[model samples]
Target: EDSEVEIEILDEPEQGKLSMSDEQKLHEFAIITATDEAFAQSILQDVDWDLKKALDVFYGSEAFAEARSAAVMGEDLKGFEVSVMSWNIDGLDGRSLLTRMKAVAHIVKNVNPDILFLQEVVDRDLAPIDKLQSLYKIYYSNKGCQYYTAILVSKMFDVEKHDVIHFQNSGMYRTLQILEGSIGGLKVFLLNTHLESTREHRPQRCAQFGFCMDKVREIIAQNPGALVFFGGDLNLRDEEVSRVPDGVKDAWEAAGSDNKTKFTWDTFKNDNKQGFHGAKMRFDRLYWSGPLDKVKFTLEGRQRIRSCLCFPSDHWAINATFFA
Candidate 1:
């Protein structure tokens, strides 16, 4: 008899009705937080329906910890494990720019990355990147005219500061776009750039890369423990990449450079056969430095669009996961 005990029932307070606009806002909060409508509502009401503060409470709660722990798949989170992607969308090809942009958006959605860096990504020439505004807070470098580079940070991240550095001697009007922000509580520095384009312009590309490294070093020296992601198309062979720096490590090489997925700017599969005429190369790369962490390739943007098996661009995107 003592094994089973009787309990008294008490009536719980009913939630107050929110107006139409408030209801919609509450629903979005639930969606973003991956929680039930009631849970989202209570947090909002607890702070007089302040959405941003609600988000802070939700993310800082043990519930968020448990959820991320599962989604992170046993990765240690002493600092923060984040996903990053870099791609060159072959914007000059005469193919449908809208289609290509949509395809890039699709691939990026599948990657579900925290930060994205793109070369040859334009908003004015075609303005295709606007569609992605729903998913990521977007920023574009003002240095290029016809085409430019861009950075996309997931809504989960709050951009604290951003700036662009142009290597004046480069033919591509190449710019280094850097975004400094915090994911949860972890500080992150994201850098994206496209060096001088062709192998024929080797010396210029070398200078551009060296300049990029200089900027990276400056930032690292200033911020001791911030996570840094520096990468893009360098258009160099094995020897050129070896000059990274004292503390830097290439993300791909760290994740087993031998992994077949290491190849980013390929000319064989998704390539449009514009100029290079089918040769595989590791023209695009990513590097990680500062703090202790491990990285692994999470996805490769090599899938043919199912509609017609058409290539999205002249390159494949590389996405990787990093953890501390």
Candidate 2:
């Protein structure tokens, strides 16, 4: 009888002692820092798994700067065009939800963006969203949650990984969804989230927004050649925005800041949420940093549903096209 001995190759004591929690931290650190797991894990281990220390060490290192420049100079990426769309579809409102979703789907089909971000997606009414699988690969932040965010990437994008990062201080169960992928030899990172809603949650909302921006900066530094898009229903006022980092531009502002597409949530035009006082706010947004230069910003889902006679969602979808 011939028997084969199973030789399991564990990378010694350092790898053997990694707890599940510690492994998760490594994965998160890798994503946030935009580095491979081995590098991130090595840095984190040296810092005793302290995230802040690991980040400081990584950012202050000479190798990081060298890698940044190397990545920035890798490809020309000229004459390429990619479009991104972000929307808060108001899935929480169950009234005529299916019809509204249908309208949203219709608008999506018409626009045909390469990347789509959706907020407030309820599990009960996921069929409409699920139908989109034909054209795009869908990633949910948390399928178990009652309502969560989603990222839909075109089939052409070769997805590397997707992860959900929950806000530590959020009571509303809000989370950020991240997708790392490549399209036509271009590396891209997409981040979407529905930040802490309502004005009262300013403390948590600002912190969450700051965290997302920090990640964006890190991604830029790590992969300057790659395109990074971070956006969703941020629930941010102009005053609340600070420390956006250099080179990262808001899609609307970069697109000449058209007044017609200024507001994504307008009670004056959209009657989905009956209100006596009309209000207009640009809650939805898209921010980007990378080699792509030209940008065109616009809004969609403005048409009223024929049956229920309401806009597809309370917040109109914000779309941006980037060209080299």
Candidate 3:
């Protein structure tokens, strides 16, 4: 069946530079543009053709710059502050993907995260990584998909070793890197991964989790003395939160002090207007081992963007602060 989709773009507000917060404005824009395709197209067209520059701004690049400025100005921030972010890019081969990536880069820049773990990332095309920086090292396995798992770490940190382990049946891979760094003279080990989604065959999905946990065990075995922090897009819901098994604890749940579940898939919530929650899930997660007090962690913010009324993706980018 064929259908026509119409989009209507809202005219710029007349309040002479509205001071609305990013979340509120984007939420309203999502509502409006989602109902009208023509409007979305119109709004997109009105955007300046400087896609590169606009993409940077939209992706939080400005925030990174300000943070750097604050640090340089001696704002009393101490210790190694790193914002670890996990995002499922959906795909990274178009203007939209570029825009989203730029936003991610902006976040990285603003937060000046020491480590970044990304899932559903495009590793086939290295252009995006090339556009990044020499300091930001990109590592991933070529699993022959538009989306794959990858890691980006600052050059300041020493990567002792790295490897990519592919789940035998899930058609996915996890990039694990051993980072040797000192957070107040205390050394730690950083492990990163992107677990399979539940959409895959149940057996394979479980296998993927098992395989990752096994690898985690191996890494922990190899570095028995260092504090370990595992971060990634796990693609499982809160009910399956136990999938992390017995070795580690969920960083959010532990850090929050209460079993509070924050929605990571904000985009999916949009699909519930018709009374279906549309697979209520928490696909992203961070886990850690050893003394919790020694590690400083906090969720920065989750940005929900509405492009011509439609949510940007079926998930929200999660940011976490780690004192490393």
Name the best candidate (by lDDT): 2
How does residue 244 of candidate 2 score in lDDT?
Answer: 90
Q: Cα RMSD (Å) between model 2 and the true structure?
A: 15.0
Task: Write the residue-wise lDDT of candidate 3 on 167-201 in tens digits.
Answer: 55655444443444544444566666666655645
All candidates' lDDT scores? 0.76, 0.88, 0.55
C-alpha RMSD by candidate, in order: 20.2, 15.0, 26.4
Candidate 2 per-residue C-alpha lDDT over 129-199 given as tens digits, one digit per residue, 9 for 90 to 100: 89999999999898888899999999999999998999989998999899999997789999999999988
- Residue lDDT tens for model 1, 1-324: 669764645674455344346788688887786767876777777677778777887778764676557546642367556888888887777566677677788777877788888888665435556778899999887634777888899898889999887778876678788899977766889888888877788888888788888878988889887778899766768777546776788887788876577566666655466454667778878888877568887436677766645677777777878877
Which candidate do you rate higher for TM-score, 1 or 2? 2
User: Sorted by TM-score, highest first, which candidate order results?
Assistant: 2, 1, 3
Total clashing residue pairs per candidate?
Answer: 0, 0, 20
Candidate 1 stretches with Cα past 4 Å from truth are 1-76, 124-128, 274-277
**10 residues in a row with least lDDT, candidate 3:** 33-42
Per-model TM-score, in order, reads 0.71, 0.77, 0.60
What is the Å distance of residue 286 in model 2 from its true position? 0.6
